[PDB]
Amino acid sequence: AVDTAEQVYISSLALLKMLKHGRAGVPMEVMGLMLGEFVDDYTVRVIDVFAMPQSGTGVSVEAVDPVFQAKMLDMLKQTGRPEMVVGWYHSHPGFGCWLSGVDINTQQSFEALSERAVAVVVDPIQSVKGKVVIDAFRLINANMMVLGHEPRQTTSNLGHLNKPSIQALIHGLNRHYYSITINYRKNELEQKMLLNLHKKSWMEGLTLQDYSEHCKHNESVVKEMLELAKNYNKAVEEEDKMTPEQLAIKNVGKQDPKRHLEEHVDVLMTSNIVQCLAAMLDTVVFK
Amino acid sequence: QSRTGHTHMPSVVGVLVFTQFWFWFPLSHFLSLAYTPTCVIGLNKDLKMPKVQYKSNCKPSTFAYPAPLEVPSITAKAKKKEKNPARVMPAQLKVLTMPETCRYQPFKPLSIGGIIILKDTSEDIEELVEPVAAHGPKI
Amino acid sequence: MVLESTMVCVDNSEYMRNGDFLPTRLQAQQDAVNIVCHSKTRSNPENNVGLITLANDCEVLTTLTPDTGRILSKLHTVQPKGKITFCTGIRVAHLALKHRQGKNHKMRIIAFVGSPVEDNEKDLVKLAKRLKKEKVNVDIINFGEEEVNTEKLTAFVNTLNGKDGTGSHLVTVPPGPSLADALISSPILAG
Numbered sequence: 155a156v157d158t159a160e161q162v163y164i165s166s167l168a169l170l171k172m173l174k175h176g177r178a179g180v181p182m183e184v185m186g187l188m189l190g191e192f193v194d195d196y197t198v199r200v201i202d203v204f205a206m207p208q209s210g211t212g213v214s215v216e217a218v219d220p221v222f223q224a225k226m227l228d229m230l231k232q233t234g235r236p237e238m239v240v241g242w243y244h245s246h247p248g249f250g251c252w253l254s255g256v257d258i259n260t261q262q263s264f265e266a267l268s269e270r271a272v273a274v275v276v277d278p279i280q281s282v283k284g285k286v287v288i289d290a291f292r293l294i295n296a297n298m299m300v301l302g303h304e305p306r307q308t309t310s311n312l313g314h315l316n317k318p319s320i321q322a323l324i325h326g327l328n329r330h331y332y333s334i335t336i337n338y339r340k341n342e343l344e345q346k347m348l349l350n351l352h353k354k355s356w357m358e359g360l361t362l363q364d365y366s367e368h369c370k371h372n373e374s375v376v377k378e379m380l381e382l383a384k385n386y387n388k389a390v391e392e393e394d395k396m397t398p399e400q401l402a403i404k405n406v407g408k409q410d411p412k413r414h415l416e417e418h419v420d421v422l423m424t425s426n427i428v429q430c431l432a433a434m435l436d437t438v439v440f441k
Numbered sequence: 442q443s444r445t446g447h448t449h450m451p452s453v454v455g456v457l458v459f460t461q462f463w464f465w466f467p468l469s470h471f472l473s474l475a476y477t478p479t480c481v482i483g484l485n486k487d488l489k490m491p492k493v494q495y496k497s498n499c500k501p502s503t504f505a506y507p508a509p510l511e512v513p514s515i516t517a518k519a520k521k522k523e524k525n526p527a528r529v530m531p532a533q534l535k536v537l538t539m540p541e542t543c544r545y546q547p548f549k550p551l552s553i554g555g556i557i558i559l560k561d562t563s564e565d566i567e568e569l570v571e572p573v574a575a576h577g578p579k580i
Numbered sequence: 581m582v583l584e585s586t587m588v589c590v591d592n593s594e595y596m597r598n599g600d601f602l603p604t605r606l607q608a609q610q611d612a613v614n615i616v617c618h619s620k621t622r623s624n625p626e627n628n629v630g631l632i633t634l635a636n637d638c639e640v641l642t643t644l645t646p647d648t649g650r651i652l653s654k655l656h657t658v659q660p661k662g663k664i665t666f667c668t669g670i671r672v673a674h675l676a677l678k679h680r681q682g683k684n685h686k687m688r689i690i691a692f693v694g695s696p697v698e699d700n701e702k703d704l705v706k707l708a709k710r711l712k713k714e715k716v717n718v719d720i721i722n723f724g725e726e727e728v729n730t731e732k733l734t735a736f737v738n739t740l741n742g743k744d745g746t747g748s749h750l751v752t753v754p755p756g757p758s759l760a761d762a763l764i765s766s767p768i769l770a771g
């Protein structure tokens with residue numbers, strides 16, 4: 155009867171694989187597996203993550219083929235992936251990220267081996283692209299109903315676990331159910347590689363290609379945009395002619411939500427492109 | 442920091458570890474080592490305990506204890522005796538004044554609160570010695 | 581039972597189709613591979629058998645597998661091109677022995693040579709020194725001949741073969757009407 159504080163380690167591997175699984179997150183019920191190695195009790199790491207072929211039966215304990223499972227696992231053993239399965243993941247599109255009866259039953263059946271059995275549910279469908287943040291799931295014992303619910307230390311991370319702030323599902327399904335915190339890990343190799351690759355993704359091959367293009371497009375394309383900018387600015391100025399009257403009348407309080415400033419500032423920011431590319435053209439002409 | 446102006450190492454350690462309670466809560470037990478008692482010392486000899494009573498220029502009622510709910514202009518002398526010195530504010534060290542009629546006085550004039558000894562001016566009998574406690578929760 | 585890996589090399593040249601000796605003995609030694617792999621199947625079915633040729637470009641027809649079912653189908657289309665190659669033919673097998681599944685299986689590689697060796701004694705004794713260094717069992721089998729049977733090949737085998745006790749054996753088959761099956765089944769390496 156001992157319980158410690160566990161934290162699920164998530165890398166970019168499983169994340170991206172769950173993004174591809176997000177593209178695979180069609181309403182048809184799907185299956186997934188997670189692999190890794192357990193160094194100790196209170197830490198869990200996942201590395202190898204793959205998908206599973208779809209079926210008409212949907213998610214079930216019968217849907218998982220044991221011989222095919224062990225086969226693929228053996229194929230992973232002969233290769234450079236010597237990690238045991240740490241659990242299984244799936245998708246629950248549109249009816250919520252919670253777990254049904256069959257799901258918690260096959261979870262109960264799959265947790266017979268591993269005491270941990272990390273449960274991850276991804277649902278990109280109603281999830282905005284603003285945040286990819288996901289919440290891992292856990293299974294409480296049925297014999298702990300007499301004593302306290304969660305005997306876990308390090309309560310400082312519950313505020314980080316407060317991200318699902320929804321006022322329904324949380325304390326609604328809180329009975330015999332709970333969750334676990336999620337953190338990531340990054341080294342220098344992944345950092346430098348991904349940063350350089352992304353910067354290059356926002357850049358060009360020789361990087362000198364599409365610059366001079368816009369530099370020479372300043373006299374064609376941008377000019378029209380500058381004319382339109384002058385049109386909108388004048389459309390503001392005609393009201394700005396009406397403004398000093400109000401400034402000569404009330405001056406108390408602001409009934410106009412329009413700032414009229416920062417937008418024109420941004421217009422100037424778009425106007426600075428000519429100045430910034432001027433030196434560029436100078437460098438091109440010079441040498 | 443200390444009275445001499447130097448900072449206490451176990452105090453800084455204690456309070457920083459106290460701020461380290463975020464990661465590990467049981468580590469907050471090191472706060473007890475950062476506790477610094479505020480008082481004076483009227484002790485002259487190791488086996489001899491005298492009694493020194495001074496006076497203050499402020500109100501004793503203002504320096505008293507804020508007794509909570511039950512739920513079942515100048516003081517003649519300080520409340521500190523048998524030296525059991527109570528809590529003392531560093532700002533109250535400037536307002537204390539030694540009695541001119543006091544029998545026992547140190548060789549060094551007392552100005553700011555700190556660690557000092559007591560010197561016998563009379564060098565005679567009747568040192569007013571008090572007994573020692575008995576067995577219990579402590580040693 | 582016995583845990584070991586089996587690597588068989590077949591000669592894809594046109595010297596096997598000659599009219600003096602057996603009428604395209606490739607099929608005969610194919611049947612030999614069949615009966616010895618079925619023998620190994622009867623003894624220890626968990627053993628895997630790989631297949632590759634001695635030609636210039638090394639191309640694996642079938643990866644090592646306990647099931648010879650598809651192997652029997654892959655025994656066809658020998659692609660009769662090239663002549664012979666030795667060094668990279670060794671390096672494509674002995675160095676590829678690390679790709680096996682079971683790590684408890686012993687390393688055993690044989691060869692069928694129907695063509696004269698183009699490599700000098702230097703490469704021979706060097707590669708033999710390498711195989712002796714990494715300690716891999718090698719069985720030399722030569723079907724058909726032009727020049728003298730064993731000249732430098734004797735010293736080659738002697739230098740290649742270490743651990744005299746229960747070590748490797750040399751198989752030398754002369755011309756004759758009899759098949760190669762019962763002839764290569766004579767040593768202890770077969771069955």
Ligand SMILES: [Zn+2]
Binds near residue numbers: 246249
């Ligand atoms: Zn559903």
